[PDB]
A paper describes a structure:
The mature PR-RT has all of the enzymatic functions of PR and RT [reviewed in]. The arrangement of the subdomains of PFV RT is similar to that of the p51 subunit of HIV-1 RT while the PR structurally resembles a single subunit of the catalytically active HIV-1 PR dimer.
Two mutations, H507D and S584K, were made in the PR-RT. The PR-RT mutant C280S/H507D/S584K, designated [name], gave a 4-fold increase in expression compared to the WT in bacterial strains. When compared to WT, the [name] mutant had similar RNase H activity and showed a modest reduction in the polymerase activity. The structure of the WT PR-RT was initially solved by using the anomalous signal from the selenomethionine (SeMet)-substituted [name] mutant, and the model obtained was used as the search model for molecular replacement using the WT data. Despite differences in the unit-cell parameters, particularly along the x-axis, the structures of [name] and WT PR-RTs are highly superimposable (RMSD = 0.785 Å). The connection subdomain is further tilted slightly towards the polymerase active site such that it sits almost parallel to the palm of the RT compared to its position in the p66 subunit of HIV-1 RT where the two subdomains are orthogonal. This compact fold allows helix L (K in HIV-1 RT) to pack against H, while helix O (L in HIV-1 RT) tilts towards the active site loop positioning T552 of PFV RT to form a hydrogen bond with Y314, and T556 with H236, while H507 forms a bifurcated hydrogen bond with S237 and N364. The H507D mutant employed in the SeMet protein also makes analogous contacts, and the SeMet PR-RT crystallizes much faster than WT.
Numbering used by the authors: 7 to 52, 56 to 694, 697 to 753
Write the structure that this text describes.
């Protein structure tokens, strides 16, 4: 539990003891007492009567004799009374996590009224014991331990090859912390399981076990938790959502002693074994998620997957009241919550098990139908790929042959490898896509036919078509918006990610029917065999991906007709059309620029920018201002140069920010041609200083995209809104900055 464990021998063999608190006597695990003859017998209520003994054992090598009782558990529950010389100390592991930053970040990113927010701040110190305070700190379920030596045919010990030593240091800490708490034991065994390293985002390495041999030895004879698609249709959607990360909760369940060998692995020649459920093993995920779902069966609105728990309510009092019941259940069960990834009391939870943030209030989530604009090719190979991509539409889009003539009129005309795109060609590409998005080329879902899904993927996005089985038009397309990490996946993994995404929206359209999936992969047998140096996706991904092959209402098929897409340009997303309120953010950055005639004939011009940091929380308040003289530059470059400054000053703000511009050019260009200018390389602008001014709002939005940019005219504006006050302030500053001369 949460006292330092204590290392001991009884009869030759070593074992762990946990300091006790009750007035009960010292329980020994039941298999040591078997040969010992009983002293008296005595009825324990919490009235099962039991034999009592008097035995000798060691604690830190020193000998103890004690009046003891039998325990079905794996450890010694040690009475403080029996050991008056030793004192109880708390658990000491290697690296103390920054629980304070974690808690501050969660109190920050919260939609709770500061009233309940303050009640959460008291809850963080109410069951502080149920929070992960140390790295590698595991919990301890006091449950009946599991037996995974099922199936009589043993697996065959896999040899352990050498691995990267540059990872051994950060992995040894883990090994030593999981020994100290008894999660590993040093037990030479008949099985050897292979081990590999994978890099962690922080620059350390985390260890992976390749259990694919053991797993074919044991059967999935167990009531599996509902799968991703089962959970995502059932979930309640109400105002306040919350997700909690069990820190490797499967490590909390123990396994029987006769099972330790099965889990064995070698690390620096010494062959260790697991006291607890291992990650990789066939039945871990379902046994742990089973127990979780039992523990929260009384809670109205809860969904669990792997170790991620999501709970949501409408009434902010009832949310935190239910959440305390959960904290109690998890504490008394021995579980351990990690607040680094956890998200409490938020109107949008960044992920509820799968890769999809939750928002608003319906029982089912609801995603954007239409796909996004592709950017222009930079190459012949990039043009041929998109051609071969659109080729399927000839048969159901009447205005295709014409639309596409100009693009082909681009293959042979500039027959010199690289071609040339006019700006009107990009307008024709957008016209192409809009056709496919018009409701006359979209079929309707037919409950008699089966539901067909055609899946491919570029490097930038996944491409998904939905058809009816015999249909000639697609019900709806669906493009995929890869997360920052999803981008790091290999190709085939991009295809499988996209499959999970597509099947979540699909679980709505099938409406009691079957689903057929067509893809460029020849088998769903050969792919489980893909070697682990190639899997660039966490095996949580590969698991969630392969849970779908146990569903009878889903079949996978190889479509030879599909085009090779490893040469599609970038998709052009947009933070545009979601223009939102003026005041609901966490900060507002007004911007302006002026330029006037120059006093020295040589410079010819003279510009100044202006910037305002205001927050519109309870009411308008100004946090800082700025009036910066720029030199001889375009007035439009003052208005441009001001938003770069306020974007850079925003990276310091963990939250949503708003940036206001007088300049239609900047405010539109930062919405319509910026995603384009990026995938162009700033070619044929403008000498060099001009180009080195646009790139930096690019890079600054890349790093933080939760920053929006609006526009306004603002001429002769008396009080045209509540919003123009700030932009008059900012126009005063940029004009002030203009008049000053160096
Ligand atoms: Ca102006």
């Amino acid at each position: 539990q949460l006292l330092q464990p204590l290392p001991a021998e009884i009869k030759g063999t070593k074992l762990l003891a946990h300091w006790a608190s009750g007035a009960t006597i010292t329980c020994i695990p039941e298999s040591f007492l078997e040969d010992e003859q009983p002293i008296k017998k005595t009825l324990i209520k919490t009235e099962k009567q039991q034999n009592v003994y008097y035995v000798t054992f060691k604690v830190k090598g020193r000998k103890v004799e004690a009046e003891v009782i039998a325990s079905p558990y794996e450890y010694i529950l040690l009475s403080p009374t029996d050991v008056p010389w030793l004192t109880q100390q708390p658990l000491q592991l290697t690296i103390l996590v920054p629980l304070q930053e974690y808690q501050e970040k969660i109190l920050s990113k919260t939609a709770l009224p500061e009233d309940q927010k303050q009640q959460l701040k008291t809850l963080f110190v109410k069951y502080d014991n149920l929070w992960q305070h140390w790295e590698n700190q595991v919990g301890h379920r006091k449950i009946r331990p599991h037996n995974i030596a099922t199936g009589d045919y043993p697996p065959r010990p896999q040899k352990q090859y050498p691995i990267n030593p540059k990872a051994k240091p950060s992995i040894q800490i883990v090994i030593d912390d999981l020994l100290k708490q008894g999660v590993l034991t040093p037990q030479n065994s008949t099985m050897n399981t292979p081990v590999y390293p994978v890099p962690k985002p922080d620059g350390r390495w985390r260890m992976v076990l390749d259990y694919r041999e053991v797993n074919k030895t044991i059967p999935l004879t167990a009531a599996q938790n509902q799968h991703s698609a089962g959970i995502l249709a059932t979930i309640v959607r109400q105002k306040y959502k919350t997700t909690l990360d069990l820190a490797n909760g499967f490590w909390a369940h123990p396994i029987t002693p006769e099972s330790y060998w099965l889990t064995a692995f070698t690390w620096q020649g010494k062959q260790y074994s697991w006291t607890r459920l291992p990650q990789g093993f066939l039945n871990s995920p379902a046994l742990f998620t089973a127990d979780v779902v039992d523990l929260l069966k009384e809670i109205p609105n809860v969904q669990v997957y792997v170790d991620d728990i999501y709970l949501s309510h409408d009434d902010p009092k009832e949310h935190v009241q239910q959440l305390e019941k959960v904290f109690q259940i998890l504490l008394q069960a021995g579980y351990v919550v990690s607040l680094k990834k956890s998200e409490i009391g938020q109107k949008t939870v960044e992920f509820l098990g799968f890769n999809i943030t939750k928002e608003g209030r319906g029982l089912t989530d609801t995603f954007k139908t239409k796909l996004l604009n592709i950017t222009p090719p930079k190459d012949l190979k990039q043009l041929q790929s998109i051609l071969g991509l659109l080729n399927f539409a000839r048969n159901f889009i009447p205005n295709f042959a014409e639309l596409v003539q100009p693009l082909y009129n681009l293959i042979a005309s500039a027959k010199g490898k690289y071609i040339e795109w006019s700006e009107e060609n990009t307008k024709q590409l957008n016209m192409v896509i809009e056709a496919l998005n018009t409701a006359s080329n979209l079929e309707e879902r037919l409950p008699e036919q089966r539901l067909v899904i055609k899946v491919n993927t570029s490097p930038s996005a996944g491409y998904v078509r939905y058809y009816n089985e015999t249909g000639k038009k697609p019900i709806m397309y669906l493009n995929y918006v890869f997360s920052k990490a999803e981008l790091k996946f290999s190709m085939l993994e991009k295809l499988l990610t996209t499959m999970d995404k597509a099947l979540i929206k699909a679980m709505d359209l099938a409406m009691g029917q079957e689903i057929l999936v067509y893809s460029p992969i020849v088998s769903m047998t050969k792919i489980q065999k893909t070697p682990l140096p190639e899997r660039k996706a966490l095996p949580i991904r590969w698991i969630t991906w392969m849970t779908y092959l146990e569903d009878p209402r889903i079949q996978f098929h190889y479509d030879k007709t599909l085009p090779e897409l490893k040469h599609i340009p970038d998709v052009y997303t947009s933070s545009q059309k979601p223009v939102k309120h003026p005041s609901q953010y966490e900060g507002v950055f007004y911007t302006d620029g002026s330029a006037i005639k120059s006093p020295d004939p040589t410079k010819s011009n003279n510009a100044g920018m202006g910037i305002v940091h205001a927050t519109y929380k309870p009411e308008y308040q100004v946090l800082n201002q700025w009036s910066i003289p720029l030199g001889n530059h375009t007035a439009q470059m003052a208005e441009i140069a001001a938003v770069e400054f306020a974007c850079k000053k925003a990276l310091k703000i963990p939250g949503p920010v708003l940036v206001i511009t007088d300049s239609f050019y900047v405010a539109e260009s930062a919405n319509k041609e910026l995603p384009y200018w990026k995938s162009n390389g700033f070619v044929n602008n403008k000498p060099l200083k001009h180009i080195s001014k646009w790139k930096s709002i690019a890079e600054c939005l890349s790093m933080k995209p939760d920053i929006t940019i609006q526009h306004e005219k603002g001429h002769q504006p008396t009080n045209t809104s509540i919003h123009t006050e700030g932009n008059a302030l900012a126009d005063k500053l940029a004009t002030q900055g203009s008049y000053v001369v160096n």
